[PDB]
């Protein structure tokens, strides 16, 4: 099958900025320029149709996002263990989500950790109970 | 599923005719997106339950208890335990449906991340018991942790301090037996295989439905267009669109029902993980048969496996009571 | 107080109820908007079909419109049934939480909030409930050397309830969830067999509280 696939726009809150990234699902970055025909408004669409900041993910090809070797908590789920955020000059970056912070318990066969204080923690849990009874 | 491409194959006339039916394609796309988001959320709740990524000590001396069959094996390319690797191998073409606008999408969390989460949970429970499941992780020897768990089920801790060797030997023997049973039994993972087969069969039926004439002269849009004039091609394409839309609606309804069932199953699995792996549950027959002691989580393709370790009386003697 | 802020500062705190309402509104809007589709007919207005066309073909036009509208209604009703089943499951979960978390203390882990659950408070909201879970969480932890048992006169002593800890030289017995060291005595410890089988036993002296009274 020639190619085909979906096109998605990754954009943060409009209050933050307006720049966006374009993801073409399950397609190599080589065919992206011809996959959209480049017959659009001269800036913007052509800018997001190609450029230096092009990343090849298992979920597809991403354009308009800067690949960073760092790992942060997932903000915008891209897929295949990869996410995107707006962290920086602020721009759009793509990274691999980190499954929390590393830890190592000092386990020993003759040592036990006992609490010396305490805290009263109050948390909220919201649950729907019903809906509108439309007729 | 691409509703437009699926119903109409690169046919401008077919797309124009379908445009008069409303916005069913948008409804189906929204339903599929919601199903995918629900699957991702279910996976997150089931697995993403611990923040810190705990790691086992370099030296594994737990008073004789052996956890090799459940701890990750760095020797293999994938950092997964022997049981996890066996589960992955024992479960087994979907990409062969990428011909009629049927995308498969990527899972949000890779198998590596799920394995890492399982290993972190195992390390936390082994090195900290249930303390890490309620707040700051507190270290404790495994012997004392098992003594606590025995006390939880109404048995004095002296029994463990007197038969630690026997208990460790029994635990290792049971781990070996369960590993052997999983290896030698191909029906142990029936649920996941059945779910995969159901999904594959549904997709196969959906794609095969495109070959039905639905009362039209032919099942190929191009053939109808070439062999008939617009006045009759209109009605033929309309009938084909109606049939394909009905098939798509049926498939989407079935997918929604299956997604609801899987969401219920995932909620149950998350509850079991919270109440058994992270602590001792007094509920009868919830975290396995017998007096529940503890549980070990493992990851399988689109599923979880709980190894419930429980205390069971073995030999009884008659006595006179007052 | 923080809870109030947690609702005022965060706009998406009530995401579930708002999402449910938005989904219902979108479904209703799509259902009402579906009436504007021709469904293959010349027009989507019954009056237009009746006036323009004679009964002969007006019959088939009305049949097509009826089929389309009926299909839309069936799809909407199926979606509503699925959503109602989901909401019934959610309501059952909420009722179970209210019965267990609010009307009593639940030992289930992570069921009524995070940590050692203490008490739940219910609150209402448009088509939803909010449970405020107050729980006990350890804050500061200190690590001490520990032993599984203690031998005094050739007999292994195990704590009645708690754990043996050592602040270096001395030894004490303290409760598991709080550091309250106490002098080891026969009242808070019990004997079970000799002290040549337990692995890791540590020698120490168990203070008998009877001796001071006997001496005096
Ligand atoms: C526990 O008991 C049950 C119940 O049956 C038993 O039958 C006999 C053995 C009884 O023996 C008494 O034991 C008491 C202490 O445990 C008591 O202190 C006495 O020592 C003894 O009775 C006294 O002494 C004898 C010598 C005599 O003088 C009596 O007059 C005295 O009072 C007692 O344990 C108990 O009732 C066992 O399960 C089975 O229960 C059956 C009845 O429900 C009993 O009868 C039949 O046995 C035949 C044998 O072929 C079976 O085919 C049949 O189905 C039925 O079972 C069984 O004998 C008995 N045992 C078995 C193996 O079926 C149980 O085995 C026993 N032990 C344990 C570990 O539970
Ligand atoms: C905790 O548990 C683990 C796993 O159960 C132990 O690690 C080893 O586990 C295997 C299980 O039998 C054993 O080691 C393996 O023995 C295989 C043959 O069995 C004999 O081999 C040894 C050495 O020759 C004999 O002395 C002994 O009598 C065994 O009966 C070997 O073939 C294995 O080598 C490689 O090939 C096999 C082929 O099937 C693989 O399956 C293996 O994984 C391996 O890649 C292997 O040597 C033995 O019981 C355990 N120890 C060792 C050193 O192997 C841990 O020892 C145990 N305790 C801990 C971890 O503290
Ligand atoms: C509570 O229940 C537990 C078990 O659930 C009991 O512990 C078991 O006791 C039996 C009998 O004492 C043990 O079985 C015996 O083990 C002997 C030790 O052999 C070692 O090597 C073999 C090699 O295969 C291992 O399988 C075995 O576990 C040992 O590591 C064997 O030698 C015995 O076989 C022969 O024993 C005598 C000689 O001593 C012969 O005369 C016999 O004919 C027989 O052929 C026998 O197999 C069993 O191993 C124990 N369990 C465990 C986990 O070790 C407790 O005793 C019981 N307690 C009470 C109070 O009832
Ligand atoms: C591990 O934990 C143990 C137990 O707490 C520590 O040992 C004790 O440490 C405390 C504080 O350092 C000591 O407290 C002392 O008390 C003296 C009076 O106690 C009388 O009785 C003891 C026997 O139990 C006699 O040895 C002593 O001479 C007294 O007759 C005080 O005189 C000491 O100085 C000041 O404190 C007291 C507090 O009331 C004042 O009233 C005095 O007037 C004086 O100004 C001191 O406070 C205690 O004696 C130690 N032993 C015991 C058995 O409790 C270890 O130090 C600790 N180790 C580590 C590494 O942390
Ligand atoms: C009580 O627990 C503390 C920490 O929880 C122990 O101190 C040491 O803290 C380290 C903090 O992470 C632990 O990890 C270390 O991290 C550093 C990097 O920051 C590494 O370079 C180092 O190799 C460790 O991995 C460490 O495990 C922990 N214990 C150590 C270092 O021994 C504390 O230990 C006490 O202090 C140290 C300095 C030694 O003197 C210990 O003998 C001593 O017990 C723990 N104490 C007890 C009694 O359990
Ligand atoms: C266990 O933790 C509690 C708090 O979680 C400790 O009590 C708190 O201790 C801090 C530090 O002393 C107090 O802060 C102080 O407040 C005064 C004003 O009252 C201020 O002048 C100081 O500069 C300092 O900020 C705090 O008020 C106090 N209470 C609370 C509710 O936080 C307690 O001491 C801990 N116990 C042990 C044994 O460590
Ligand atoms: C916890 O782990 C420590 C090690 O991290 C264990 O310490 C070990 O204890 C054994 C038994 O006391 C020592 O065996 C040695 O045997 C020789 C010959 O019989 C004897 O002369 C020594 O005095 C000693 O007993 C072993 O050397 C020792 N290891 C280390 C590194 O010190 C400890 O037993 C474990 N269990 C507990 C409850 O602490
Ligand atoms: C805790 O206390 C007990 C008793 O007070 C200690 O037991 C003692 O163990 C030593 C050996 O480790 C014994 O020494 C040898 O005993 C044998 C058999 O009695 C004897 O034939 C030898 O000539 C030698 O004396 C000792 O007798 C035994 N009892 C006493 C009172 O010392 C135990 O060692 C202590 N544990 C620790 C960790 O210190
Ligand atoms: C964004 O700014 C506008 C106006 O300032 C307003 O909508 C709001 O304050 C901000 N947030 C959103 C979601 O619009
Ligand atoms: C297309 O991308 C895949 C990775 O998904 C890579 O293996 C392959 O070599 C690429 N092909 C071309 C022509 O770039
Ligand atoms: C990331 O790491 C690779 C090595 O695998 C390196 O080639 C690349 O330059 C690094 N990029 C950044 C932004 O650090």
C114 CA to middle of ligand 6, Å? 24
Contact, C185 vs C207, CB < 8 A? yes
**Which regions of chain C does DSSP assign to beta strands (E)?**
116-125, 128-138, 141-145, 150-151, 155-159, 163-166, 171-174, 189-194, 202-203
Q: Is residue B286 less than 8 Å (CB to CB) from chain C?
A: no
What span, in angstroms and rounded, lies between the C-alpha atoms of B182 and B300? 12
Q: Give the H or E element holding residue C95.
A: helix C55-97
Candidates B103, B108, B139; nearest CB to A107: B139
Chain C residues with CB within 8 Å of chain B CB:
30, 33-34, 37-40, 68, 71-72, 75, 78-79, 82, 85-86, 89, 107-111, 114-116, 137-139, 141, 143, 146, 148-149, 156, 158, 163, 176, 192-193, 197-200
Q: Sign of dihedral through CA atoms B54, B59, B63, B66?
A: positive
Q: Is residue A120 less than 8 Å (CB to CB) from chain C?
A: yes
What span, in angstroms and rounded, lies between the C-alpha atoms of A58 and B110? 11
The arrangement of strands across the sheet holding A93-96 comes to A66-67, A93-96, A82-85, A76-79
**Are B113 and A110 inside 8 Å of each other by CB?**
no
Instruction: List CB contacts of A62: < 8 A, sequence separation 6 or more.
Output: A10, A21, A22, A23, A54, A55, A78, A84, A94
Residue with tokens 């947690």: C6
Question: Across the strands, what pairs with C116?
Answer: C136
Query: Strand A54-57 vs strand A60-63: parallel, antiparallel, or unpaired?
Result: antiparallel
Query: Strand C163-166 vs strand C171-174: parallel, antiparallel, or unpaired?
Result: antiparallel
SS3 C132: strand
- Which chains contact B through at least 3 pairs of Cβ atoms less than 8 Å apart? A, C
Instruction: List CB contacts of B135: < 8 A, sequence separation 6 or more.
Output: C115, C116, C137, C138, C139
SS3 B277: helix
**Are C82 and B257 inside 8 Å of each other by CB?**
yes
CA dihedral A82, A84, A87, A92 (to 10 degrees): 130
By residue count, chain C amounts to 216
What span, in angstroms and rounded, lies between the C-alpha atoms of C126 and A68? 43
SS3 A115: strand
Query: Strand A82-85 vs strand A93-96: parallel, antiparallel, or unpaired?
Result: antiparallel
Phi-psi label, residue A60: left if phi above 0, alpha if psi -120 to 50, beta otherwise: left
Closest to A19 measured CA to CA, from A65, A70, A76, A72: A65
B60, B61, B66, best to mutate for ligand 2 pocket (most atoms within 8 Å of CB):
B66
| Backbone φ and ψ of B295, nearest 5° | -150, 150
Contact, C173 vs C196, CB < 8 A? no
What span, in angstroms and rounded, lies between the C-alpha atoms of B139 and C141? 10
Contact, B157 vs C158, CB < 8 A? yes
What span, in angstroms and rounded, lies between the C-alpha atoms of C27 and C80? 9
Smallest CA–CA separation between C213 and chain A, in Å? 34
By residue count, chain A amounts to 135
What span, in angstroms and rounded, lies between the C-alpha atoms of C111 and C101? 8
Phi-psi label, residue C127: left if phi above 0, alpha if psi -120 to 50, beta otherwise: left
**Are B101 and A115 inside 8 Å of each other by CB?**
no
What span, in angstroms and rounded, lies between the C-alpha atoms of B98 and A4? 10
Smallest CA–CA separation between C75 and chain B, in Å? 8
What span, in angstroms and rounded, lies between the C-alpha atoms of B268 and B117? 18
Other Cβ atoms closer than 10 A to B320:
4
What span, in angstroms and rounded, lies between the C-alpha atoms of A61 and A78? 10
**Which regions of chain A does DSSP assign to beta strands (E)?**
7-10, 21-25, 54-57, 60-63, 66-67, 76-79, 82-85, 93-96, 111-115, 118-128
A32 CA to middle of ligand 10, Å? 13
What span, in angstroms and rounded, lies between the C-alpha atoms of C66 and A70? 58
Contact, A75 vs A96, CB < 8 A? no
Best residue of B134, B258, B271 to probe chain C, by most C CBs closer than 10 Å: B134
DSSP string, B115-166: HHHHHHHHHHHHHHTTGGGTSS-----HHHHHHHHHHHTT--THHHHHSHHH
By residue count, chain B amounts to 322
What span, in angstroms and rounded, lies between the C-alpha atoms of B266 and B273? 10
Supply B249's token pair: 């609606």
| Backbone φ and ψ of C134, nearest 5° | -100, 125
Q: How far is CA C44 from CA B20, B22, B23, C54, C62, in A?
A: 10, 11, 15, 16, 9
Question: Across the strands, what pairs with C104?
Answer: none
Residue with tokens 């789920």: A77
Resolution to 1 decimal place, in Å: 2.7
Ligand 2 within 6 A of CB of B197: no
Contact, C116 vs C100, CB < 8 A? no
Contact, B92 vs B198, CB < 8 A? no
Q: Is residue A105 less than 8 Å (CB to CB) from chain C?
A: no
Contact, B119 vs B82, CB < 8 A? no
What span, in angstroms and rounded, lies between the C-alpha atoms of B90 and B186? 7
Contact, B271 vs C89, CB < 8 A? no
Candidates A113, A128, A134; nearest CB to C127: A128
Residue nearest to atom 5 of ligand 11 (CA): A69
Phi-psi label, residue C174: left if phi above 0, alpha if psi -120 to 50, beta otherwise: beta
What are the chain B neighbours of C109 within 8 Å (beta carbons)?
130, 133-134, 274-275, 278-279, 281
Instruction: List CB contacts of B44: < 8 A, sequence separation 6 or more.
Output: B108, B109
Closest to A11 measured CA to CA, from A70, A80, A78: A78
Scanning every residue of chain B, which has its alpha carbon at the shortest distance from the alpha carbon of C90?
A: B264
CA dihedral C3, C9, C12, C14 (to 10 degrees): 40
Q: What is the separation of C-alpha C19 from the centre of its chain, rounded to a whole number of angstroms?
A: 20
Q: How far is CA C204 from CA B147, B160, C207, in A?
A: 21, 21, 10
Phi-psi label, residue B182: left if phi above 0, alpha if psi -120 to 50, beta otherwise: alpha
What span, in angstroms and rounded, lies between the C-alpha atoms of B294 and B303? 20
Ligand 2 within 6 A of CB of B173: no
Experiment used for this model: cryo-EM
Using alpha carbons only, give the angle B204, B205, B211 rounded to the nearest 5 degrees: 105
The arrangement of strands across the sheet holding A7-10 comes to A7-10, A21-25, A60-63, A54-57
Best residue of C33, C40, C157 to probe chain B, by most B CBs closer than 10 Å: C40
Closest to B129 measured CA to CA, from B297, B280, B269, B274: B280
Q: How many CA atoms lie within 13 A of C190 on its CB side?
A: 7
Other Cβ atoms closer than 10 A to B132:
24
**Which regions of B150-216 does DSSP assign to beta strands (E)?**
none
DSSP string, B52-69: SB----SS--BTTB--TT
């Amino acid at each position: 099958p020639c190619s085909f696939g979906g096109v998605s726009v990754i954009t943060p809150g409009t209050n933050t900025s307006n720049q966006v990234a374009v993801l073409y699902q399950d397609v190599n970055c080589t065919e992206v320029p011809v996959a959209i025909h480049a017959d659009q408004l001269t800036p913007t669409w052509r800018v997001y149709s190609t450029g230096s900041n092009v990343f090849q993910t298992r979920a597809g090809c991403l354009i308009g996002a800067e690949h960073v070797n760092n790992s942060y908590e997932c903000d915008i789920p891209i897929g295949a263990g990869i996410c995107a955020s707006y962290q920086t000059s602020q721009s759009i970056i793509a990274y691999t989500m980190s499954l929390g912070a590393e830890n190592s318990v000092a386990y020993s066969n003759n040592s036990i950790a006992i609490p010396t204080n305490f805290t009263i923690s109050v948390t909220t849990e919201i649950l729907p109970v019903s809906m509108t009874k439309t007729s | 599923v691409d509703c437009t491409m699926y119903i109409c194959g690169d046919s401008t006339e077919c797309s124009n005719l379908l445009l008069q039916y409303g916005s069913f394609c948008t409804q189906l796309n929204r339903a599929l997106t919601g199903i995918a988001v629900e699957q991702d959320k279910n996976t997150q709740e089931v697995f993403a339950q611990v923040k810190q990524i705990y790691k086992t000590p370099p030296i594994k001396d737990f008073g004789g208890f052996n956890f090799s069959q459940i701890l990750p094996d760095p020797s293999k390319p994938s950092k997964r335990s022997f049981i996890e690797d066996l589960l992955f191998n024992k479960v087994t073409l979907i990409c062969a449906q990428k011909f009629n606008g049927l995308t498969v999408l990527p899972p949000l969390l890779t198998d590596e991340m799920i394995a890492q989460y399982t290993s972190a949970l195992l390390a936390g429970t082994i090195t900290s018991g249930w303390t890490f499941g309620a707040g700051a992780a507190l270290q404790i020897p495994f012997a004392m942790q098992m003594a606590y768990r025995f006390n939880g089920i109404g048995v004095t801790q002296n029994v463990l301090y007197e038969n630690q060797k026997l208990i460790a030997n029994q635990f290792n023997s049971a781990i070996g037996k369960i590993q052997d049973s999983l290896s030698s039994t191909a029906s142990a993972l029936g649920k996941l295989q059945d779910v995969v087969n159901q999904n594959a069969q549904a997709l196969n039926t959906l794609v095969k439905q495109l070959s039905s004439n639905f009362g039209a002269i032919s099942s190929v849009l191009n053939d109808i267009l070439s062999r008939l004039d617009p006045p009759e091609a209109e009605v033929q394409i309309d009938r084909l669109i109606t049939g394909r839309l009905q098939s798509l609606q049926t498939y989407v309804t079935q997918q929604l029902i299956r997604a609801a069932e899987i969401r219920a199953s995932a909620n149950l699995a998350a509850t079991k993980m919270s109440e058994c792996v992270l602590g001792q549950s007094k509920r009868v027959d919830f975290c396995g048969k017998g007096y529940h002691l503890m549980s070990f989580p493992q990851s399988a393709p689109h599923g979880v496996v709980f190894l419930h370790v429980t205390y069971v009386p073995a030999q009884e003697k008659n006595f006179t009571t007052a | 107080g923080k809870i109030q802020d947690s609702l005022s500062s965060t706009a998406s705190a009530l995401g579930k109820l708002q999402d449910v309402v938005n989904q219902n509104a979108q479904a209703l809007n799509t259902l009402v908007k579906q009436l504007s589709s021709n469904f293959g007919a010349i027009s989507s207005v019954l009056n237009d079909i009746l006036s323009r066309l004679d009964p002969p073909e007006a019959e088939v036009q009305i049949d097509r419109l009826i089929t389309g509208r009926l299909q839309s209604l069936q799809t909407y009703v199926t979606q509503q049934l699925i959503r109602a089943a989901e909401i019934r499951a959610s309501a059952n979960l909420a009722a179970t939480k209210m019965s267990e978390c609010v009307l009593g203390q639940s030992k289930r882990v992570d069921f009524c909030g995070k940590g050692y659950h203490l008490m739940s408070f219910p609150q209402s909201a448009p088509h939803g409930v909010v449970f405020l879970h107050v729980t006990y969480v350890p804050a500061q932890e200190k690590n001490f050397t520990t032993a599984p048992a203690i031998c005094h006169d050739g007999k292994a002593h195990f704590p009645r309830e708690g754990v043996f800890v050592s602040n270096g030289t001395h030894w004490f017995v303290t409760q598991r969830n709080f550091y309250e060291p106490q002098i080891i005595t026969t009242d808070n410890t019990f004997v079970s067999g000799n002290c040549d089988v337990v692995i890791g036993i540590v020698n120490n002296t168990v203070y008998d509280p009877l001796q001071p009274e006997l001496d005096s």
